C-alpha cells in the first residue's frame, strides 16, 4: 500500500541530459578502452604545453651555439642547421618532468658515399634515440649533454 519516495535526482538526470552517469564506471572502464582525444581539447593542451615549454626553456641553460628553437606545437625543434634535428617535449608539469625525444634526425647527407641512400639507417638513429633518451633520464642539465 505504501508508495516509495520519488527519487527525483535520477529523473533530473534523465530528462535534462538523456543519460545516466549514476552507474559504476568500472563497467565502461574495465570493458571499453577510453575515448580518443578530439580536436579543441587538443589545441588547448598544445597551447598550454607551448607556454610550459617556453617557461621551462627560459630556466634551463639552453645550448646557445647554433640551436635556433621554435616552440612550434609543443615541440621545441632544436635544429642546428648543419647536421642535426631534434624535437623535444615535456609531458607533465613545469618543475620535474624529463624530456621526450619525439623525433631525432641527421641532416648530414652525401648521395655518393652513401650509395644514393641515407647516410644512417633508422636502426642506428633509433639506437642514438635510446642513448640520448637515457642521458636525458640521467637528469643533469640535460640540453648541454
Amino acid at each position: 500500500a505504501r508508495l516509495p519516495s520519488f527519487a527525483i535526482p535520477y529523473a533530473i538526470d534523465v530528462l535534462t541530459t538523456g543519460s545516466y552517469p549514476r552507474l559504476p564506471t568500472c563497467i565502461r572502464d574495465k570493458i571499453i578502452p577510453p575515448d580518443p582525444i578530439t580536436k579543441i581539447e587538443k589545441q588547448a593542451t598544445l597551447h598550454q604545453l607551448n607556454q610550459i615549454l617556453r617557461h621551462r626553456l627560459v630556466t634551463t641553460d639552453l645550448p646557445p651555439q647554433l640551436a635556433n628553437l621554435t616552440v612550434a606545437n609543443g615541440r621545441v625543434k632544436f635544429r642546428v642547421e648543419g647536421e642535426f634535428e631534434a624535437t623535444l617535449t615535456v609531458m607533465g608539469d613545469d618543475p620535474d618532468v624529463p624530456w621526450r625525444l619525439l623525433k631525432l634526425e641527421i641532416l648530414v647527407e652525401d648521395k655518393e658515399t652513401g650509395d644514393g641512400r641515407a647516410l644512417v639507417h633508422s636502426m642506428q638513429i633509433s639506437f642514438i634515440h635510446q642513448l640520448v633518451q637515457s642521458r636525458l633520464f640521467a637528469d643533469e642539465k640535460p640540453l648541454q649533454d
Binding site: 652513401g114 650509395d115 642506428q124 642521458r135
Partner: peptide
C-alpha cells in the same frame, strides 16, 4: 581465413659514441 655497406664505419662510430657517452638509467 636495406643496408648500404658503409654501415661498418657508422657502427664503429656508434661504439665510439657508446664509450664517449655512456647510457645512464
Amino acid at each position: 581465413f636495406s643496408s648500404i655497406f658503409q654501415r661498418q664505419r657508422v657502427d664503429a662510430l656508434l661504439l665510439d659514441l657508446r664509450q664517449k657517452f655512456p647510457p645512464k638509467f
